[PDB]
Amino acid sequence: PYNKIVSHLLVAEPEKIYAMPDPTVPDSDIKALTTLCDLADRELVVIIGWAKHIPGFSTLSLADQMSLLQSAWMEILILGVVYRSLSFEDELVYADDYIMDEDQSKLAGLLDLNNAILQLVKKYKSMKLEKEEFVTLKAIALANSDSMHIEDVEAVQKLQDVLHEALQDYEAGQHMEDPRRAGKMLMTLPLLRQTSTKAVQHFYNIKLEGKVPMHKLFLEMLEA
């Protein structure tokens, strides 16, 4: 069937970006980590602009808009990676020009983290995650981000409600053969949160170690 929110979210789905790693620079771990951060950093611009295309999001105060993005950003980054990686096996498509297999994760000291993301990938593969579900969940992730600093709680709750309702309809319409599918989707969010935290903490340590340069936006989101 048709759902209005799902259709908007599909259309707001932004374009590919690329890691553009230096082929001159030798394959070490700081190369890997720097690329991922530059990417993440540019990927955050996209996310910021993508948020605005979420029905209701711009209706919130600018403060709430920040708070949600400050809680959820890494979940959205990871969801991006996860989705891109669904057609692959045991590899993570950080970008089209940057795909990490197990060995490449080790080299960069990201095995544990990337395994957890892979776990996420494998779950959505086992569920046959559709684009429509993915964009809705990504939006829900943003809206259900549990910031401590929300001014207008009822508006954010409304936004959660709206996004939630759309998932209900989409699954009601497209997946009547599984009247729980929506809830199964929502039940993947804990592991998303967990993996997001694991990642935030790992890269925060790297910031502190001072060896990996990081562009401003990335740092600003990291220190929040």
Partner: peptide, 13 residues
């Protein structure tokens, strides 16, 4: 601030 600027700035894809 940078987050804020970008929210306030326009999306140019």
């Amino acid at each position: 601030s940078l987050l804020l600027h970008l929210l306030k700035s326009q999306t140019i894809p």
